[PDB]
Write a protein that binds this ligand. Structure first.
Ligand SMILES: CC(=O)N[C@H]1[C@@H](O[C@@H]2[C@@H](O[C@@H]3[C@H](O)[C@@H](O[C@H]4[C@@H]([C@H](O)CO)O[C@@](O)(C(=O)O)C[C@H]4O)O[C@H]([C@@H](O)CO)[C@H]3O[C@@H]3O[C@H](CO)[C@@H](O)[C@H](O)[C@H]3O)O[C@H]([C@@H](O)CO)[C@@H](O)[C@@H]2O)O[C@H](CO)[C@@H](O)[C@@H]1O
Lengths: 215, 213
């Protein structure tokens, strides 16, 4: 059994967007489906329910009249169409399969929906290198990017131990993020260490390689 | 219908018994539990109050009737650390969720390691200045950073971020950034990072002089 959500992105307030769920590995027309969303601030919130028939639909009191849930049985696809989007609508949205008693056995990976007036902006990535002996700490600073999410990797992900990546914090419509990596002194600067940052929204792919510096 | 979960957060050492509470506004038709490990979707854990999902371990139990339901673990485990959510269906919308219980893993006190990073040459060329402090691998979680310029505390334009508990260490780390204009940054020579933690009465201090680097 698999469920794959899609159709997420950045949306204007008062905008409309549609999400889809593709269901595989079970008899689809048999089951009811739900939409559930999560925000760090407000956590787990149910959105809407559609019966296998489509005859029965339930809507969250908050989304009523602005959101419509529908399905296409031949396709195996579940639909949520959103209109009149508000800031509170920003969430990660999961499609779920309804089981007896209405608990959810299977969940989707999720699509993130962000609704903001704020303009898309690419990050600038700065390597952080030690200042002027038994260990070394280095950092990547990624700042001035909107919206989430960014992906930070070290050495193509080849280097994953002693890594800390810190959640982004948003100030004045822009996000700041950082990462620190700790490797033994023999390891750096002898072998190469690089910061790879990916911003999907900007299509930005950037690499920063830490270099010791002095004048 | 309102589900109230207590405690909001708890710490359990390994080999400890832990119990969690969901409180219901009205008698519930169905009470379910889910487990979420952050950065992934919530997982099915318990359905219909007492029934284990295939693949959940024996230690977990689900209980309660009427208004009060409980989740307990026989013995705490490292892998167990997660957020737990209770959910209900009464046969009428809305279907409703708990605020959730965050279960931390208790461990020995640890002191942070502190690193201070001056602004990058590229950032300066760009016309801005940023200074970063890392506070790495400490316990327990609450911590303080103070910034000093030329001996004077600066509280303005500082952003702080926390990881969740580390996978191997079970520790926490925090990151601090001080943001200045280049011209302003060039006003002062010395930048200092002060970190205060329960482990030590005295703060741990790192600094550099704009001169020399
Ligand atoms: C959100 C909610 O209220 N969910 C409750 C709902 O679950 C829905 C339910 O739909 C079934 C299904 O479409 C089908 O049943 C077939 C099989 C089933 O595939 C496996 O048991 O079950 C039967 O053999 C049976 O014993 O009844 C009949 C089979 O045809 O058909 C019935 C139809 O009669 C609907 O017209 C349907 O049951 C009704 O569904 C509607 C929702 O439109 C509900 O309002 C009625 O009260 C139901 O009688 O069951 C599905 C099932 O696989 C898991 O529960 C589920 O995915 C659907 O969401 O009703 C459940 C059972 O009463 C309840 O547990 C849910 O809380």
């Amino acid at each position: 059994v698999q469920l794959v959500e899609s159709g997420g992105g950045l949306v204007q307030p008062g905008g409309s967007r549609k999400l889809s769920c593709a269901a595989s590995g079970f008899t689809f027309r048999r089951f009811g489906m739900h939409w559930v969303r999560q925000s760090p601030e407000k956590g787990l919130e149910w959105v809407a329910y559609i019966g296998g028939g489509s005859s029965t639909i339930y809507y969250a009191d908050t989304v009523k009249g602005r959101f419509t849930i529908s399905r296409d049985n031949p396709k195996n696809t579940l639909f949520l169409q959103m209109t009149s989007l508000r800031s509170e609508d920003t969430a990660m949205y999961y499609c779920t399969r309804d089981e007896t008693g209405s608990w959810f056995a299977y969940w989707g990976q999720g699509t993130l929906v962000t609704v903001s007036a704020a303009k898309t902006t690419a990050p600038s990535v700065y390597p952080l290198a030690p200042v002027c002996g038994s260990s070394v700490t280095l950092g990547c600073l990624v700042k001035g990017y909107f919206p989430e999410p960014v992906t930070l990797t070290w050495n193509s992900g080849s280097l994953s131990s002693g890594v800390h990546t810190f959640p982004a914090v948003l100030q004045s419509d822009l996000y700041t993020l950082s990462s620190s990596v700790t490797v033994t002194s023999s390891t750096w600067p002898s072998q190469s260490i690089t910061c790879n940052v990916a911003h999907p929204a900007s299509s930005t792919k950037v690499d920063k390689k830490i270099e010791p510096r002095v004048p | 219908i309102v589900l109230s979960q207590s405690p909001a957060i708890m710490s359990a050492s390994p080999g400890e018994k832990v119990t969690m509470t969901c409180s219901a506004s009205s008698s519930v038709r169905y009470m379910h539990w889910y487990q979420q490990k952050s950065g992934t979707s919530p997982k099915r854990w318990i359905y219909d109050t007492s029934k284990l999902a295939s693949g959940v371990p024996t230690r977990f139990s689900g209980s309660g009737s009427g208004t009060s339901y409980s989740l307990p673990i026989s013995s705490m485990e490292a892998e167990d650390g997660a957020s737990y959510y209770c959910q209900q269906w009464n046969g009428y919308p809305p279907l409703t969720f708990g605020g959730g219980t965050k279960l931390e893993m208790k461990r020995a006190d640890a002191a942070p390691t502190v690193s201070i990073f001056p602004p990058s040459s590229e950032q300066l060329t760009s016309g801005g200045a940023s200074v970063v402090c890392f506070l790495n691998n400490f316990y327990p979680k609450d911590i303080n950073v103070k910034w000093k310029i030329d001996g004077s505390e600066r509280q303005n334009g500082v952003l702080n971020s926390w990881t969740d508990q580390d996978s191997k260490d079970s520790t926490y780390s925090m990151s601090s950034t001080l943001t200045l204009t280049k011209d302003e940054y060039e006003r002062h020579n010395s930048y200092t990072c002060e970190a205060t933690h329960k482990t030590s009465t005295s703060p741990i201090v790192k600094s550099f002089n704009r001169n020399e680097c």
